[PDB]
UniProtKB/Swiss-Prot annotation:
Compartments (UniProt record): Nucleus
Protein name: Mediator of RNA polymerase II transcription subunit 26
Residues of the full protein shown: 1 to 87 of 600
Domain of life from the UniProt record: Eukaryota
Subunit architecture: Component of the Mediator complex, which is composed of MED1, MED4, MED6, MED7, MED8, MED9, MED10, MED11, MED12, MED13, MED13L, MED14, MED15, MED16, MED17, MED18, MED19, MED20, MED21, MED22, MED23, MED24, MED25, MED26, MED27, MED29, MED30, MED31, CCNC, CDK8 and CDC2L6/CDK11. The MED12, MED13, CCNC and CDK8 subunits form a distinct module termed the CDK8 module. Mediator containing the CDK8 module is less active than Mediator lacking this module in supporting transcriptional activation.
Domain TFIIS N-terminal as annotated: residue spans: 11-88
Family the entry assigns: Belongs to the Mediator complex subunit 26 family.
Name of the coding gene: MED26
Physiological role: Component of the Mediator complex, a coactivator involved in the regulated transcription of nearly all RNA polymerase II-dependent genes. Mediator functions as a bridge to convey information from gene-specific regulatory proteins to the basal RNA polymerase II transcription machinery. Mediator is recruited to promoters by direct interactions with regulatory proteins and serves as a scaffold for the assembly of a functional pre-initiation complex with RNA polymerase II and the general transcription factors.
Length: 90
């Protein structure tokens, strides 16, 4: 069976950093996939997204990943976060 539990958005952000290189290169793909899956299950708020800078991180991880599912899930997540930020400027 599959088992998971909720985590705070900062813990989810931390798990990502521990699963990638500072250049956003993937080091622990299974953990990165689980982080994306965790964010798709547990939405973050605009204010929290801003401090966590997760919007920028997921976007660059998406550029460095060779795994298309990771890139597709990241695309879904970022599309959701576009409305979460709702920018009217740069």
């Amino acid at each position: 069976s599959m088992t998971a539990a909720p985590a705070s958005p900062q813990q989810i952000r931390d798990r990502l950093l521990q699963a990638i290189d500072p250049q956003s290169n993937i080091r622990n793909m299974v953990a990165v996939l689980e982080v994306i899956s965790s964010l798709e299950k547990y939405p973050i708020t605009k204010e929290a997204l801003e401090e966590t800078r997760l919007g920028k991180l997921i976007n660059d991880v998406r550029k460095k990943t060779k795994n298309e599912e990771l890139a597709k899930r990241a695309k879904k997540l970022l599309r959701s976060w576009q409305k979460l930020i709702e920018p009217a400027g740069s």
